[PDB]
Amino acid sequence: PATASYTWDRNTATEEGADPVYEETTVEVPVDPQRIVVFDMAALDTIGALGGEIAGAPLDSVPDYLEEYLADDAFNAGTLFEADLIAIEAQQPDLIVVGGRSSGLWADLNEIAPTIDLSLRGSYLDTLEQNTTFLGKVLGAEAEAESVLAELEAGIAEAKAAVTEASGTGLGIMVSGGQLSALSPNTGNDPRGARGGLIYDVFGVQPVLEDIKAATHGEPISFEFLLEHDPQWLWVVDRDAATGAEGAQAAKVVLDNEIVNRTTAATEDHVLYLNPTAWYIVFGGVETTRIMIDDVLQVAAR
Numbered sequence: 001p002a003t004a005s006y007t008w009d010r011n012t013a014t015e016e017g018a019d020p021v022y023e024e025t026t027v028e029v030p031v032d033p034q035r036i037v038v039f040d041m042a043a044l045d046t047i048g049a050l051g052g053e054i055a056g057a058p059l060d061s062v063p064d065y066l067e068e069y070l071a072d073d074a075f076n077a078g079t080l081f082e083a084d085l086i087a088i089e090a091q092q093p094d095l096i097v098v099g100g101r102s103s104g105l106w107a108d109l110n111e112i113a114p115t116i117d118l119s120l121r122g123s124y125l126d127t128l129e130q131n132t133t134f135l136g137k138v139l140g141a142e143a144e145a146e147s148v149l150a151e152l153e154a155g156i157a158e159a160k161a162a163v164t165e166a167s168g169t170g171l172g173i174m175v176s177g178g179q180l181s182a183l184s185p186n187t188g189n190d191p192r193g194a195r196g197g198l199i200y201d202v203f204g205v206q207p208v209l210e211d212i213k214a215a216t217h218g219e220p221i222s223f224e225f226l227l228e229h230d231p232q233w234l235w236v237v238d239r240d241a242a243t244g245a246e247g248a249q250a251a252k253v254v255l256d257n258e259i260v261n262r263t264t265a266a267t268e269d270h271v272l273y274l275n276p277t278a279w280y281i282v283f284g285g286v287e288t289t290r291i292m293i294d295d296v297l298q299v300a301a302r
Contacts, residue, residue, distance in 0.1 A: 003028040004137050006116045014104030027114050032140050033095035037077050037088060037109075040099030043118050044069060045285025046132050047097070049148055050141040056091055063277045065287060080281075081105075088112055095138070100283075120191045120284060124202055127284060128152065148286050155289075159296040160204045166299040168232030168270075170205035171212070172196065174280075175251040176239040179220045183237075184212040195283050199235050199274075203296045223259040233299065234265035235272050242276030272298045 006027050011020040037056035038044040041063060044054055048069025056077040057070060075091055078084045080101045088096070089112050096115040098106050109115040118134075120127045129149060136145025163170075172183030174196070185207055186197030199205050208231040209215050215229075226234070238251035251273065255266070265271050278291040 002031040004031050004134075005029075006134065008117065008121070010106065010117055011103055011119065016101065016103065025117075027110065027116050029114050029116055029138055030094050031138060033138065035091070035093040036095045036097065037091070037093040037113075038097040039077065039080065039083070039102035039105065040097060040118060040284075041066060041080075041282040042284030042288060043097040043099055043131065043135070045282060045287050046135050047139065049286035050132075050135055050139050050144045052135075052139050052141075055093060056088065061281075063282060065277075065291070066282075066285075078105075083109060085109075085112065120194055122189050122191065122194075124194050124198055124284070125156075128289060131284070132286065152286065152289050152293075155293040156202065159293050162297050162300040163204050166233065166302070168206070169208045170199070170233040170235060171208040171226070171229070171231035172199040172205070172235045172237070173221075173226075174237045174239050175254050177245065177248060178254055180223070180225070182212050182216045182221050182225070183235075184216065187213065195280070198279070198283075198292075199296075203292075205233065205235065223257055226263050226265070227259055230264050232264060232268075233270045233272065234263070235274060237274045237279050238276045239280055242280045269302055270299075272302070 006029050008025060009022040010025040012023050013020050035055040036047065036052065038047060038054050039058060044057060044066055047054060048066060053071050054069055054074055055071050056075045058079045059076045061080050062070065075087065077088055083105050085108055093113045096109045096113050097118060098109060098115055099118045103117055103119045106115055106117050118131045132145050132149055136142045174181045174183060183196040183199060185200040186193045200207055208229045236251050240248035260266055274295045275291050278288045282288045
């Protein structure tokens with residue numbers, strides 16, 4: 001009937017737009033927990049992949065590829081941002097897992113049952129390894145955790161090889177509301193920007209500019225930006241697809257314009273679309289990382 005001690009540097013800020021202030025926190029998590037409530041899809045992902053089952057979750061947000069890991073009678077815990085604390089309290093969970101968008105809900109949830117925050121810390125890759133190992137200990141699935149990490153390391157290396165063999169320069173963009181935002185390699189340990197940098201930081205695409213963030217100003221880029229710097233490969237994340245934005249046109253059609261069609265990437269069939277839900281909503285987790293690996297491996301085929 002053991003517990004496992006979890007200690008991390010918690011962002012005490014509740015807005016995710018606020019300058020973080022980190023404070024070390026420890027929580028005693030029960031081993032082999034029997035009613036887990038998860039708000040962070042990436043933790044939901046990994047818990048499923050190690051053989052677990054989710055008892056409660058923001059159901060309206062669970063991606064179809066993770067739907068299978070819900071309990072047959074799983075209850076709705078809230079949304080990605082907000083908790084139904086009366087429902088949850090009634091449901092008497094024994095472990096609650098929070099992260100990212102739900103990071104701020106930590107203190108309220110922890111009053112109900114031991115809650116851990118598996119927000120991204122530092123490296124996407126460091127987070128993948130730590131969270132998966134830890135959850136392994138919680139679920140009594142240490143062997144499975146060792147195994148999926150081995151698989152994921154081999155898959156990631158496979159994709160990096162594919163990217164290297166494609167060579168060239170690349171640019172990651174995120175389309176939202178007909179607008180374009182340049183993705184940039186993550187500079188610093190700032191975990192706000194780890195997601196954008198994934199394509200460069202984990203998979204090794206060489207950036208079209210040695211300092212994209214600089215040239216970008218932080219402001220959206222024009223179609224003319226693509227044409228100017230003309231990356232060999234263009235990696236596209238349709239953010240509106242992932243968030244359920246109404247009246248939004250698909251990334252594909254947004255990029256179907258006289259300017260972009262003159263781009264090297266377009267004329268050479270070097271525009272690759274990444275899975276919006278995986279790359280933008282979930283961003284972490286075992287099955288999600290596999291989806292990423294398959295997405296990157298598309299360069300091999302072009």
